[PDB]
Amino acid sequence: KLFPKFSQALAQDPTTRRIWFGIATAHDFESHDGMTEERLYQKIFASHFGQLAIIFLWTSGNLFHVAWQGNFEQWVQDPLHIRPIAHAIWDPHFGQPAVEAFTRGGASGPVNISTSGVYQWWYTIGLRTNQELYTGSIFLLVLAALFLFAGWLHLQPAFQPALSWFKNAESRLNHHLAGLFGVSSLAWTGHLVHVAIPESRGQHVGWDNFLTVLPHPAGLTPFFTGNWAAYAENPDSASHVFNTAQGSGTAILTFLGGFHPQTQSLWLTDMAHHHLAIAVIFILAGHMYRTIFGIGHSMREILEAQTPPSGSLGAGHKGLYDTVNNSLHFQLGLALASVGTISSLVAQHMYSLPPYAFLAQDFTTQAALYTHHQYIAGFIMCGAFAHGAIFFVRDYDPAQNRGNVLARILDHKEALISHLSWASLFLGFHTLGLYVHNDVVQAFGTPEKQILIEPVFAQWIQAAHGKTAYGFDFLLSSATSAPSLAGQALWLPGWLQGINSDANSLFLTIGPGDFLVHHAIALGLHTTTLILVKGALDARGSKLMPDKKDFGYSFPCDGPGRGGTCDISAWDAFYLAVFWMLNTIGWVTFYWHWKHLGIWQGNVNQFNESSTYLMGWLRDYLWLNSSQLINGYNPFGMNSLSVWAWMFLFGHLIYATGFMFLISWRGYWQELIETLAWAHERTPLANLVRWRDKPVALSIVQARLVGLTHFSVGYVLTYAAFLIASTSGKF
Amino acid sequence: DVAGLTPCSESKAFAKRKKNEVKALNKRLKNYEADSAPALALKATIARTEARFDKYAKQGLLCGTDGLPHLIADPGLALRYGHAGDVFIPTIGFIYFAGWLGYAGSKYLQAVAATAKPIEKEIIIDVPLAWKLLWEGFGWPLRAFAEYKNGSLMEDDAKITVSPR
Amino acid sequence: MSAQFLPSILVPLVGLVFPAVAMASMFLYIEKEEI
Amino acid sequence: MKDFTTYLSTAPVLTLLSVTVVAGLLIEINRFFPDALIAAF
Amino acid sequence: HGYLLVGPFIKLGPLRDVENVAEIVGCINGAATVLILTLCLAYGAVTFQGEG
Amino acid sequence: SHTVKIYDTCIGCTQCVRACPTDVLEMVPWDGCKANQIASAPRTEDCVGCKRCESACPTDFLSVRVYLGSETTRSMGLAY
Amino acid sequence: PDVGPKRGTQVRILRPESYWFRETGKVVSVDQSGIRYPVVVRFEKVNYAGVSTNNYALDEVVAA
Amino acid sequence: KYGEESRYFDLKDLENTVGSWDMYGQEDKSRYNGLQSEFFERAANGLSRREYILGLVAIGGAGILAWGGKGAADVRLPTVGPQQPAQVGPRGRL
Amino acid sequence: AFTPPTLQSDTPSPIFGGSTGGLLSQAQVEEFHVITWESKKEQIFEMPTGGAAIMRQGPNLLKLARKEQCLALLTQLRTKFKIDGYIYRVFPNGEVQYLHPKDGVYPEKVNAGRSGDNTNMRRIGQNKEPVQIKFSGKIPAEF
Ligand code: CLA
Ligand code: CLA
Ligand code: CLA
Ligand code: CLA
Ligand code: CLA
Ligand SMILES: CC1=C(/C=C/C(C)=C\C=C\C(C)=C\C=C\C=C(C)\C=C\C=C(C)\C=C\C2=C(C)CCCC2(C)C)C(C)(C)CCC1
Ligand code: SF4
Ligand code: SF4
């Protein structure tokens, strides 16, 4: 009866809704009984330590499983003909053909073929042996234990920091930029130069001999005399072979750009140079704000001074420092927005500029990594907007935000929502109309009547990069231009060789189907932003419900009065926008996967004349690439793709089980549960036992969340199964 | 050649596509007698296909890797290379016609809003008034610009409902 | 793969023993009345 | 016929006749001017 | 109930087609008795912690 | 255990009291409106949260506001 | 003396929480007994509940 | 109850009016015969306490783990048997 | 002053055939409500639990699982029969609490002598902002 000790209101519920909401309100510390702000922030800090320990344990487990059951030794010697092994399989449900079908990469028993790209990353950063991976796993185990001890320690009242320490923004930014960002990047440069650079050239460097091996034959003296160009003397040749000393070099900070010819990945010396420059700039950035040494910035005064005259922004940024600092939800929204955008950047960059050795030959790994980071980015961006809506519901003070840009953007929120609606409506109308017109003219036997708008602007920017394929001869595509001549002895040769080659993903050739799918992506982003922005801006109140801020961020409705108030809270707007995020990321990853499937087969045409109409999308992509997937098991037997077929049907089942909660609502189920309670309360031989908690139907918000969770899980599992099966079974 | 595209008058794959379509229609032909109604229908379809392909080659459309016409949606890039009819001229045409329809509907709204029962006039449409305003909406751009310069096109924000933030 | 017996013990431990004990423990704790 | 013409002026009758005449005009435009991909003057 | 649960595992278990099905089914039923036993344990511990 | 509140915009039309299916609302004497009566909620422990009172309030915006809160065996409307 | 706007005049609602905020309404009656919201304002535009009249105070209503 | 006519409520006899009944439970001392009752209470003697009936589940889980240690292989089971060649893959891999 | 009427336990019940929607296990260990009304003739009404019942001449006694069922029966008696009634809350320990016509007259009619609680003297939009009551365990409207 006293299980939700954080919420005595929930503990007095004599139903199963008590435990259901006890699970789901456990991390809403602000809503907990007897919660001060000091205890809030200290709990936040300790939970952060727990999360860091969890992440470190997870990567240590990856290292230990690859070192213990993987084929890292065999993969290092033959990176292009050995399947990386994730972990061994011990499932007593396997029949004998399942045991044979899962024994693949030279292992003793059934194993899972890794698609996470940890093999390429660890091989690139200089890890060569299973002993090194085990040492890394043990070190991460110890450091996660240390972080757990720190989380315990800072909850103790002798070591609990003050609330003002948590809100010390200038110091936290200074140390994060200078130390967490800068010093870490400098240390990664040190690892790359000391370990990864020699291990890329067949020279083993470890803790036993890194103090007796010289990273550059002219040690430190060029660094200290300012002759820094001596660290970029002889780069690795185009004939260089990875992990061997054949045609290597001595330079540690090259600057050639492009890709390594053998690994089809970026130069490691380029990475060391990049990380060193990033470390310098981030340490400088961390020397910006004022702490205790009489120099630096007060960010409050910077926000005060950012008020343009003539009342263009009203009061400008009056009191935004306190608005951000007092609100944990504002900070969490900013952090989630930035982190989701960075995750999208990571997805968009690692496929086109492959960083790790022998990446972009493992086609399943690239597709899986891209789709993973894109889905993570979409979820995190929805979380950013949801926490912005929470900040409007909870932490927004109109008095201290009077005249500043927040009050201005809340003042004319109808214009923002209406213009997002106009943009989404235009994009949906036009993209769907062009697609349906193309479908109809394709069906009627007239492909020449298609509307194929050439993406001339994106092709123009591609030409500005040096892509001499559309004949613009603009900036970098003309060698006579000032940017072309400026770095022609710098990054221009390698970058131009990468940009003019059709064998990589460095800015692929685009056509009308790319135009149509880019407008589809624009429609998805616009509509998801419309739902999320409308939910945030209408979170405090609307015309249908003026006092919405009093009812909280999440609540079922306001009853059937005033015409009906279903899905009126900002939580419901986030709920509706998660579907649109899933649809948008589905479009993005469908586009990426079909384009790269055309590229990897050498048949760019299949996408070029099949993406302009939707029947080509359904038939030449969804229907065609699922043939090996659905034959993972059959009456004639089974093979290694059986797990992805089972996960395919599994995700379909979870998706429709989500539809169950999505369509049916709480009222039929409550009557059914009452009828079954009547049945059990007077069934003979079962009246001996009775429920401690009264069985009730799931609440409206709870079942909306459950249906959304099943929808997302089925979506993700289905697409992951299809993508990994259709790429790994084919390549 | 505006973006690596070749004109469909000289692109080989356009002629190949036209030949394939005509050959498929001839394969359809080679089953009926010469003067039957299906024969006349297929002959008309063939004539329409050849006319369409010859017109597309005549109008100066751009073909990509294969023989499919591509449209240019950049002013200047389509103006100086003679493809303003791809997007720009239909852009002007749609803007004019949509403005005509929208201005006619707007003027109907403001005409029936100042009547005895504006509620009834929107389900029971005054047909002569609608016809007159549809005719008057052909001068929509000049009327709209005049009302914008007069300030009578937009409404002051102090007379428009908003939510209580 | 060294120590092949260890998955054969650990997988039932985290699939049957630890989950059954955790589910029983949490079921006891959610209805502890007076913790 | 005042009530009959008022019924003809009702929103569904007028919108069905209007979409009918617009669709017929577009259909006869495509009948006499088929396969107009661009606005070539 | 223990004499009840033998039959489904005998005629239908994964090792139903081998001679030693009886012993393996006895083991399965011992495990089933143990898990139903801890179900009774948990029920009696949660519903009889006081008086009414 | 639902929070039901009455506000001074109430005109004393007694429609919220008539709409209540569990007898939560009642009319008490008042001097702030023409009808000389305002609504009151002395029995919010019997409130299920159906918001039928809100559906009957003619004041814009409504004067009988129901805030769903803690759930009991009577707020959940259980017969078992 | 009579208080509030005259009967039948044109008034604008200044209650930001009302449906007809900054809209057009006509005064039907103003009570002189001392009602907290004596001004009765009728609108041609109905709200979500379907009513077209509402009671307002004195400082949330300006004429014309 | 006092249901001699149509009166199904009584505050002095509120037990029967509420609906609390035995349905089928009846009180009787006679059921099981001699010696076997003592046999079974001796069989389930000290085990009646919650901690020892928990320890029975503990040794049951020990048996669950003993199957994995030595018991899965005694009934063969494909997850611990041997393997027969391998497959290459789509392209030149392993 | 007003005094509540006593719940006369030995009161006849309406003629009924027995339903499945009646009392359950909640009545024994939490609560069951009861409604009493005076009928002027033998006539058929509708049960809140489903089915038709005949209430008899004079006093009629009916116990129901929830108060909402009692008020549904009372309002259908008041509309389709013009019959008033009394509802009582009966605890299993024996204590009986009077319920709906608490002060004699119906709640939709004023009585002059009631408690006017939960009546705020402000408007809807005059509640406090949630940031000004942050970390309090109360909604803005109960300040
Ligand atoms: C130089 C001193 C210093 C350093 C090193 C740190 C370091 C850290 N602090 Mg701390 N802090 C400091 C000073 C410092 N702090 C001071 C002075 C204060 C008081 C004003 C605080 C107050 C404070 C609070 C309140 C909290 C922290 C927290 C944290 C942790 C952040 C979470 C994390 O690990 O993500 C790691 C971040 C990065 C790795 C940056 C990466 C940049 C982007 C996101 C990724 C891109 C990089 C690259 C492309 C990825 C490639 C890797 C891939 C190959 C695997 C982190 C270890 C949080 C915490 O977790 O609690 C323990 C937290 O709650 N700090
Ligand atoms: C740094 C990330 C971060 C952090 C710290 C928070 C923190 C918080 N969030 Mg938030 N959120 C985030 C990201 C984050 N969020 C993201 C990315 C999203 C988009 C999905 C959301 C969307 C969101 C919403 C809509 C809400 C919150 C809420 C909250 C607050 C309470 C949390 C809670 O409800 O209890 C604990 C939360 C849980 C126990 C999550 C439930 C479990 C999920 C739904 C099911 C997972 C099933 C799993 C995937 C199945 C495996 C599949 C396999 C079996 C096949 C809390 C302060 C709530 C709030 O503010 O209260 C008003 C609120 O309603 N968040
Ligand atoms: C594929 C999605 C899906 C699934 C699985 C279900 C499943 C179910 N629905 Mg449902 N429904 C759905 C979609 C779905 N629905 C949608 C989209 C709607 C909207 C129109 C509805 C609307 C609806 C209504 C109105 C009703 C149901 C009812 C039911 C239940 C019927 C009882 C039954 O089938 O017996 C058996 C259960 C199953 C077949 C489900 C799968 C169980 C598997 C096959 C076996 C279990 C083994 C398990 C996985 C092992 C445990 C592993 C452990 C680790 C957890 C059942 C659980 C009815 C009900 O309440 O019960 C009568 C009811 O009236 N549904
Ligand atoms: C002639 C009436 C009329 C006019 C002038 C407008 C004008 C406008 N609408 Mg609107 N709209 C209308 C009717 C109209 N609408 C109708 C009937 C609907 C219901 C389907 C909508 C639904 C709608 C939505 C959901 C949105 C707009 C939006 C907008 C604005 C963006 C531009 C646009 O074209 O969006 C697109 C307009 C449409 C998709 C609807 C067009 C429907 C037809 C073609 C118009 C009606 C013709 C009318 C019967 C002619 C009468 C002739 C007369 C002589 C009797 C704009 C000012 C957007 C906005 O808010 O921008 C900020 C927006 O989000 N409209
Ligand atoms: C979070 C990281 C993680 C994950 C997801 C897994 C997952 C898995 N491990 Mg593994 N393990 C890990 C870390 C991890 N491990 C680490 C760091 C070590 C070094 C000590 C090991 C050592 C190890 C061995 C020796 C074996 C496995 C095995 C397995 C497989 C079956 C589970 C099992 O029976 O072993 C149980 C796992 C452990 C006893 C240690 C795992 C402890 C992790 C770090 C807990 C992390 C929990 C997480 C942070 C929060 C989740 C909430 C949770 C506490 C409820 C399974 C796929 C077995 C296998 O190979 O299958 C074929 C096997 O025999 N693991
Ligand atoms: C709800 C809400 C929220 C949230 C929001 C969000 C979510 C936002 C966002 C957003 C985003 C997500 C954004 C993004 C961004 C970015 C940007 C805006 C940028 C930029 C810049 C530029 C201009 C660039 C340029 C360039 C290029 C183009 C490339 C190359 C280089 C250069 C530099 C040249 C908050 C909490 C706050 C508050 C409350 C409410
Ligand atoms: S929500 Fe329903 S039960 Fe509660 S006061 Fe309003 S009408 Fe009565
Ligand atoms: S319905 Fe509204 S206005 Fe009428 S008495 Fe109830 S609270 Fe007052």
PDB file of C-alpha atoms in Angstrom, chain A residues 9 13 15 17 545 547 551 558 561-562 666 670 673-674 677 681 694-696, chain F residues 50-51 54-55 61-62 65-73 76-78 80:
ATOM      1  CA  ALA A   9      -1.419  10.418  -3.341  1.00  0.00           C
ATOM      2  CA  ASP A  13      -4.988   4.245  -4.762  1.00  0.00           C
ATOM      3  CA  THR A  15      -6.205  -0.262  -7.747  1.00  0.00           C
ATOM      4  CA  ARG A  17      -3.339   2.156 -11.425  1.00  0.00           C
ATOM      5  CA  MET A 545      -9.075  25.529 -22.420  1.00  0.00           C
ATOM      6  CA  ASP A 547      -6.605  27.480 -17.739  1.00  0.00           C
ATOM      7  CA  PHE A 551      -4.064  21.173 -15.005  1.00  0.00           C
ATOM      8  CA  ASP A 558     -11.543  18.160 -20.023  1.00  0.00           C
ATOM      9  CA  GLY A 561     -18.189  19.496 -22.838  1.00  0.00           C
ATOM     10  CA  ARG A 562     -17.511  22.405 -25.194  1.00  0.00           C
ATOM     11  CA  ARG A 666     -10.958   3.267 -21.831  1.00  0.00           C
ATOM     12  CA  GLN A 670     -13.420  -0.977 -17.840  1.00  0.00           C
ATOM     13  CA  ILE A 673     -12.785  -5.803 -16.394  1.00  0.00           C
ATOM     14  CA  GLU A 674     -15.790  -5.233 -14.110  1.00  0.00           C
ATOM     15  CA  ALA A 677     -14.112  -9.190 -11.601  1.00  0.00           C
ATOM     16  CA  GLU A 681     -15.342 -12.964  -7.175  1.00  0.00           C
ATOM     17  CA  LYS A 694      -8.393  -3.768  -7.581  1.00  0.00           C
ATOM     18  CA  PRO A 695      -8.137  -4.585 -11.319  1.00  0.00           C
ATOM     19  CA  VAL A 696      -8.941  -1.491 -13.376  1.00  0.00           C
TER      20      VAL A 696
ATOM     21  CA  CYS F  50     -17.363  12.952 -14.904  1.00  0.00           C
ATOM     22  CA  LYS F  51     -17.338  16.745 -15.553  1.00  0.00           C
ATOM     23  CA  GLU F  54     -18.764  21.595 -16.656  1.00  0.00           C
ATOM     24  CA  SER F  55     -20.934  20.439 -19.567  1.00  0.00           C
ATOM     25  CA  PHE F  61     -15.706  30.543 -19.133  1.00  0.00           C
ATOM     26  CA  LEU F  62     -17.274  27.950 -16.819  1.00  0.00           C
ATOM     27  CA  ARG F  65     -14.043  23.668 -12.408  1.00  0.00           C
ATOM     28  CA  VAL F  66     -13.121  20.042 -11.685  1.00  0.00           C
ATOM     29  CA  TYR F  67      -9.461  19.112 -11.193  1.00  0.00           C
ATOM     30  CA  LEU F  68      -8.808  15.375 -11.350  1.00  0.00           C
ATOM     31  CA  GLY F  69      -6.455  14.408  -8.539  1.00  0.00           C
ATOM     32  CA  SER F  70      -6.078  11.520  -6.108  1.00  0.00           C
ATOM     33  CA  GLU F  71      -8.092   8.410  -6.989  1.00  0.00           C
ATOM     34  CA  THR F  72     -10.053   6.424  -4.398  1.00  0.00           C
ATOM     35  CA  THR F  73     -12.581   3.592  -4.612  1.00  0.00           C
ATOM     36  CA  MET F  76     -12.771   5.441  -9.760  1.00  0.00           C
ATOM     37  CA  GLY F  77     -16.466   4.485  -9.649  1.00  0.00           C
ATOM     38  CA  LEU F  78     -15.862   0.834  -8.763  1.00  0.00           C
ATOM     39  CA  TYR F  80     -16.160  -4.370  -6.802  1.00  0.00           C
TER      40      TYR F  80
END
